[PDB]
Symmetry: D2
Subunit: 64 residues, 4 copies
Amino acid sequence: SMDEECVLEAENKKLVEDQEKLKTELRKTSDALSKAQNDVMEMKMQSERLSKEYDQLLKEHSEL
Amino acid sequence: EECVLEAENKKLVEDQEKLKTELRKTSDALSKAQNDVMEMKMQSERLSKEYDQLLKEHSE
Amino acid sequence: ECVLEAENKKLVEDQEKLKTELRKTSDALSKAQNDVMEMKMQSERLSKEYDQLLKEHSE
Amino acid sequence: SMDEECVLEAENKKLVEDQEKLKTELRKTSDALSKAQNDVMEMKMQSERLSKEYDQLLKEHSEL
């Protein structure tokens, strides 16, 4: 036989479940930012190699 | 000569393309994080509304 | 009812603190995103002028 | 053709300068990203504090 206790329990359960969802969302957000951190590092190194190639190209070819 | 310049250029261009791809990936990752933060703003609003309702219903 | 009042006050202040942190975080991400788009534009100016350099001074 | 040397010098300087600008931007971008990563860590901690307060609240007050 349903009473107010049932709805109270449902409300608490929803509160807990939404905390869990927020935790999950936080972890996905940090996962995404770590992907971006790795991508930024890849760009830093790629750009250093590129800068070496520009330097080399202008040094070897004075007409450039 | 022109040969070495040609090869060097080919390499340089393919590296510019790698950098371009990397830039796109980075932007996409950051966009994903921003979407996630929108979700969390709504989720935390749901949490505080749930809490408030809990209080209004079951306390003085 | 007193301890409930104290706990509620605390909880409320922490919700508002989290809300503020979420805004701070979206701001921080927009700053990062802008930085990345600026690098996209910059890297395009760089490859474009490299191309111009080779078109003008090579075969 | 003195003009040629003029233009070529300017163009080379500009290429070098834009490499430098991209280098600077990369460093700053990484800084900005680290800030955001720490903002997310702060929210994890803050929401864990909120979870402890919610747990405690529901545990102490059966009517909630």
